[PDB]
Design a protein around this ligand. Structure first.
Ligand code: HEM
Length: 82
């Protein structure tokens, strides 16, 4: 994830398909490039700029494809929440 720190407020500003961040386990992830390939479609924006930990750990599809979900998270961490 690195050393960059972000406040929840700043992360919230990245809530669009061309500027999409999400928080996972206190980590800030830039998912902008993933928008188009998200198997769930546009609904990924429902948590854009917000915490998606529970969703990513418990939603049926996310569990079935946990390998893909974690791989994508591990390619997108830009910092942590402070
Ligand atoms: C780490 C990357 C991902 C993020 C941040 C993400 C995020 C989300 C969010 C925020 C939602 C909407 C939740 C709600 O409103 O209740 C969602 C739905 C969904 N996601 Fe993902 N997702 C990711 C990866 C994946 C992968 C790899 C799959 C493939 C199996 C997937 C399949 C789905 C499906 C099937 C839905 C439901 C769509 C619907 O209800 O119409 N997601 N995802």
């Amino acid at each position: 994830c690195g050393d960059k720190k972000y406040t929840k407020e700043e992360v919230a500003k990245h809530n669009t398909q061309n500027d999409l961040w999400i928080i996972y386990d206190g980590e800030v992830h830039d998912m902008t490039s993933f928008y188009k390939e998200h198997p769930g479609g546009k609904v990924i924006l429902n948590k854009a700029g917000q915490d998606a930990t529970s969703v990513l750990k418990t939603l049926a599809p996310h569990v079935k494809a946990a390998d893909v979900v974690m791989k994508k998270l591990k390619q997108t961490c830009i910092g942590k929440v402070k």
